[PDB]
């Protein structure tokens, strides 16, 4: 039941500015210290900012002081992070977290990704991966979707709007030429495809794009 949902992430130019928000529910938000914590591309965690329950007192990691402002809306239960003079250093997945005084960061949101770069927003080209030169070993079939040439991270990939998750591998994006490329694979029973619809759902929030791609068998 405790929920923290961040938004506002995406691409920003070096030296530019952005505002993250974090909507909280199912606890009394206005009586908790709240924090922002980021995770760098090298997977290190860095504390960013903390704000007192009333908003009166704020604390910042040195490297953001004078650049970031943490604030809150205790009526609507929203935590904010205004970010200016952004730098490559600031590229990270940003989490809001409830901070229970000295008893920890107790609850964390899902994170919103911020990429600071002069490259351009590019929506993905999505291509089906239908198996070739195969038909062997076990009774499963593996399918996929190639998600090619997009910027910035992230994308979200589901299969049949989430129903097929248990057979799913989505690979990490590899960066080639200020563009990312990934693939996602789904393995289902040989009985269910091609007799049934398998569809990958790709969302790229930075370009406000969603793509649905039904995987249909190759033929001559």
């Amino acid at each position: 039941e405790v929920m923290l949902v961040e938004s506002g992430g995406g691409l920003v130019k070096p030296g530019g500015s952005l505002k993250l928000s974090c909507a909280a529910s199912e606890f009394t938000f206005s009586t908790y210290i709240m924090s922002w914590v980021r995770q760098t591309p090298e997977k290190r965690l860095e504390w960013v900012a903390t704000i007192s329950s009333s908003g009166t007192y704020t604390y910042y990691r040195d490297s953001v002081k004078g650049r970031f402002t943490v604030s809150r809306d205790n009526a609507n239960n929203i935590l904010y992070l205004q970010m200016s003079s952004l730098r490559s250093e600031d590229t990270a997945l940003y989490y809001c977290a409830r901070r229970d005084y000295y008893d920890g960061f107790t609850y964390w949101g899902q994170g919103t990704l911020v990429t600071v770069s002069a490259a351009k927003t590019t929506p993905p080209s999505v291509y089906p991966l239908a198996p070739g030169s195969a038909a062997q070993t076990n009774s499963m079939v593996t399918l996929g979707c190639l998600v090619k040439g997009y910027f910035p991270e992230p994308v979200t990939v589901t299969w049949n709007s989430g129903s097929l998750s248990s057979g799913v591998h989505t690979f990490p994006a590899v960066l080639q030429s200020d563009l990312y490329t990934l693939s996602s694979s789904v393995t289902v029973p040989s009985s269910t495809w091609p007799s049934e619809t398998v569809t990958c759902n790709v969302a790229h929030p930075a370009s406000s794009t969603k793509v649905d791609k039904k995987i249909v068998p190759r033929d001559c």
Partner: protein, 219 residues
């Protein structure tokens, strides 16, 4: 500044066995009050970090007894008395006894399980791509263990490295395996001047190559 060093960087351990992860700070974490504000977090793959321990040894809500934290001064240890597959991920220590609050760099816990051979599949470039002037061939190598793998591409019998991009997942919780994709990208022009395309792998479980191939003219 106050720095925190974790060791080991990666921790391979078998199910039901014991693991211990250590965190060492560059100065005493004893705050001026006499308290020590050391916490541990677990980030499971694809999730947000989760609090396990606060104030050295107190377990957060829903954290089982088989996790335990101890230490004092500059040396702290998180212990998992009996490792389950769900304990997989990266463990981070964190201090807020001294300014500024800092995390350790993380310890990856790897589950040591039985050997698992890759399921290899090869995917010819969709004809939808080719109008773009490029062609991407994808090869999946799924659900194998250990992570060590040798993947090559051949084109009409000759090896090809130029244009190959590889990516690999983290260990998967459900079965404790790794997966890998390998993608060979050519211009359409070069793609059309070759006929046979081949992804092959060797692994602990298969020293003779696992070979998946297709012909550009087949449909």
């Amino acid at each position: 500044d106050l720095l925190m060093a974790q060791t080991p960087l990666s921790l391979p351990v078998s199910l039901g066995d014991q693991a211990s992860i250590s965190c060492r700070s560059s100065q005493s974490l004893v705050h001026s009050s006499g308290n020590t504000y050391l916490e541990w977090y677990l980030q499971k793959p694809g999730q947000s970090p989760k609090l396990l321990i606060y104030k050295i040894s107190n377990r957060f809500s829903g954290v089982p007894d088989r996790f335990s934290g101890s230490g004092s001064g500059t040396d702290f240890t998180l212990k998992i008395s009996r490792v389950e597959a769900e304990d997989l991920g990266v463990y981070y220590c964190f201090q807020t006894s001294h300014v500024p609050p800092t995390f350790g760099g993380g310890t990856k816990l790897e589950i040591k399980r039985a050997d698992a051979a890759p399921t290899v599949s090869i995917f010819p470039p969709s004809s939808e791509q080719l109008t773009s002037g490029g062609a991407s061939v994808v090869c999946f190598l799924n659900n194998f263990y250990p992570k060590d793998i040798n993947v090559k591409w051949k084109i009409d019998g000759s090896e090809r490295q130029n244009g190959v991009l590889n990516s690999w997942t983290d260990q998967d919780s459900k079965d404790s395996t790794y997966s890998m994709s390998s993608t060979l990208t050519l211009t359409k022009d070069e793609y059309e001047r070759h006929n046979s395309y081949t992804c092959e792998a060797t692994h602990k479980t298969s020293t003779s190559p696992i070979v998946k191939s297709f012909n550009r003219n087949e449909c």
